[PDB]
Design a protein around this ligand. Structure first.
Ligand code: FNA
Length: 119
């Protein structure tokens, strides 16, 4: 993968996850910009859908380091990715939906999805 292919792939996942979840564009924009309303159900589901589609979350919402590295190593330096994995893999949340939004919130501290528009 390259950054340009990530951009294309992410746009597609955002599109399909929007129709799967019914999230309003305004709330999708908030998520993409890194402002996560972690308790909003459609935000949770949108986050979950994108992360599952990238194999960052497995079917039972377990965080997968391989999946997050495949994406983040395109965007930030190796050592920063290591720290991101160690940080965001240890989020204190057991509920799958809330875990999904909290994971996007944690990671957004490092890079937001909107990042890919600044290629
Ligand atoms: C875990 C991994 C990534 C993200 N956010 C995002 C940051 C920037 C590019 C991305 C590409 C694919 C999926 C999420 C991306 C949130 C939680």
């Amino acid at each position: 993968m390259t950054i340009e292919e990530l951009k294309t792939r992410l746009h597609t996942e955002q599109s399909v996850c929007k129709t799967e979840t019914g999230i309003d564009q305004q709330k999708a924009n908030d998520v993409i910009e890194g402002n996560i309303d972690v308790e909003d159900k459609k935000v949770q589901l949108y986050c979950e859908c994108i992360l599952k589609n990238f194999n960052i979350l497995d079917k039972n919402n377990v965080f997968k380091p391989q999946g997050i590295k495949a994406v983040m190593e395109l965007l930030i330096d190796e050592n920063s990715v290591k720290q991101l994995v160690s940080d965001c893999s240890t989020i204190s949340e057991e509920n799958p939906h809330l875990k999904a939004s909290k994971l996007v919130q944690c990671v957004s501290k490092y890079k937001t999805m909107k990042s890919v528009d600044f290629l």
